[PDB]
Design an enzyme around this catalytic site. Structure first.
Site, mmCIF file in Angstrom:
data_model
loop_
_atom_site.group_PDB
_atom_site.id
_atom_site.type_symbol
_atom_site.label_atom_id
_atom_site.label_comp_id
_atom_site.label_asym_id
_atom_site.label_seq_id
_atom_site.Cartn_x
_atom_site.Cartn_y
_atom_site.Cartn_z
ATOM 1 N N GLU A 1 0.542 -1.196 -0.093
ATOM 2 C CA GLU A 1 0.351 0.265 0.099
ATOM 3 C C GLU A 1 0.821 1.530 -0.118
ATOM 4 O O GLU A 1 0.163 2.499 -0.555
ATOM 5 C CB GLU A 1 -0.852 -0.338 1.162
ATOM 6 C CG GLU A 1 -2.034 -0.921 0.905
ATOM 7 C CD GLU A 1 -2.927 -1.088 -0.131
ATOM 8 O OE1 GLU A 1 -2.860 0.269 -0.968
ATOM 9 O OE2 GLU A 1 -4.187 -1.305 -0.430
ATOM 10 N N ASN B 1 -9.381 5.192 2.731
ATOM 11 C CA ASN B 1 -9.483 6.050 1.115
ATOM 12 C C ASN B 1 -10.981 7.134 2.158
ATOM 13 O O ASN B 1 -11.491 6.397 2.819
ATOM 14 C CB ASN B 1 -10.794 5.281 0.167
ATOM 15 C CG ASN B 1 -10.847 5.735 -0.827
ATOM 16 O OD1 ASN B 1 -10.781 7.161 -0.840
ATOM 17 N ND2 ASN B 1 -11.388 5.161 -2.327
ATOM 18 N N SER C 1 -11.351 10.470 -5.232
ATOM 19 C CA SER C 1 -11.334 10.235 -3.267
ATOM 20 C C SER C 1 -10.041 10.177 -3.291
ATOM 21 O O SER C 1 -8.845 10.187 -4.718
ATOM 22 C CB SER C 1 -12.260 9.105 -2.893
ATOM 23 O OG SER C 1 -11.131 7.289 -3.568
ATOM 24 N N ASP D 1 -11.730 8.237 -8.710
ATOM 25 C CA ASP D 1 -12.560 9.100 -8.717
ATOM 26 C C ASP D 1 -13.066 9.728 -7.626
ATOM 27 O O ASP D 1 -14.016 10.571 -7.953
ATOM 28 C CB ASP D 1 -14.046 7.868 -7.739
ATOM 29 C CG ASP D 1 -13.393 7.829 -6.343
ATOM 30 O OD1 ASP D 1 -12.331 7.822 -6.213
ATOM 31 O OD2 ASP D 1 -13.500 6.578 -5.465
ATOM 32 N N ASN E 1 -7.608 8.209 -6.257
ATOM 33 C CA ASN E 1 -8.139 7.381 -7.150
ATOM 34 C C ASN E 1 -8.601 8.452 -8.189
ATOM 35 O O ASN E 1 -9.250 9.400 -8.233
ATOM 36 C CB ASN E 1 -9.071 7.328 -6.288
ATOM 37 C CG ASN E 1 -8.423 6.126 -4.923
ATOM 38 O OD1 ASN E 1 -8.917 6.131 -3.834
ATOM 39 N ND2 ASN E 1 -7.592 6.001 -4.959
ATOM 40 N N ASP F 1 -6.452 8.034 -0.845
ATOM 41 C CA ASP F 1 -5.805 7.442 -0.187
ATOM 42 C C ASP F 1 -5.079 7.530 0.751
ATOM 43 O O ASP F 1 -3.726 8.495 0.287
ATOM 44 C CB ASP F 1 -5.748 6.347 -1.139
ATOM 45 C CG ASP F 1 -7.090 5.031 -1.194
ATOM 46 O OD1 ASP F 1 -8.054 5.540 -1.370
ATOM 47 O OD2 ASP F 1 -6.375 4.323 -1.727
#
Ligand code: NA
Length: 129
Positions: free
Chosen positions: A35, A59, A50, A48, A46, A52
């Site tokens: 990660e 998220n 969003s 979309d 992301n 992380d």
């Protein structure tokens, strides 16, 4: 902060992540590796819109507030910036709720694709725990 493997294993244990929801410490260290590469300051946007955040790339869509993810929730009741701290407490607390949400560690797509089914004990091999 960029943790070492055994250093992160020890911090995760101290914060009660070892065997939390049946996931051995190696499972948490392996997830963190893929990660964030153990980097507490990691952020990734992301598609979309969003973001992380942190060692476990939590998220903004569901778990933290960053003020810029329209229609999102904040289920860990924290600013996403608290997930970038050198102290991992906030990331651990919020990962505990994520892994309890019903799909276990499949919530971390890097864990499903890179850690699930592997010899995750290798991640804590030789660590004084
Ligand atoms: Na949010």
């Amino acid at each position: 902060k960029v943790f070492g493997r055994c250093e992160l294993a020890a911090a995760m244990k101290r914060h009660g992540l070892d065997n939390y929801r049946g996931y051995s410490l190696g499972n948490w260290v392996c997830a963190a590796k893929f990660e964030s590469n153990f980097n507490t300051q990691a952020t990734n946007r992301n598609t979309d819109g969003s973001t992380d955040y942190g060692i476990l790339q939590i998220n903004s869509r569901w778990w933290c507030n960053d003020g810029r993810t329209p229609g999102s929730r904040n289920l860990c009741n924290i600013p996403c910036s608290a997930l970038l701290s050198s102290d991992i407490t906030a990331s651990v607390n919020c990962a505990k709720k994520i892994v309890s949400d019903g799909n276990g560690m499949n919530a971390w797509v890097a864990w499903r694709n890179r850690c699930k089914g592997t010899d995750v004990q290798a991640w804590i091999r030789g660590c004084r725990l």
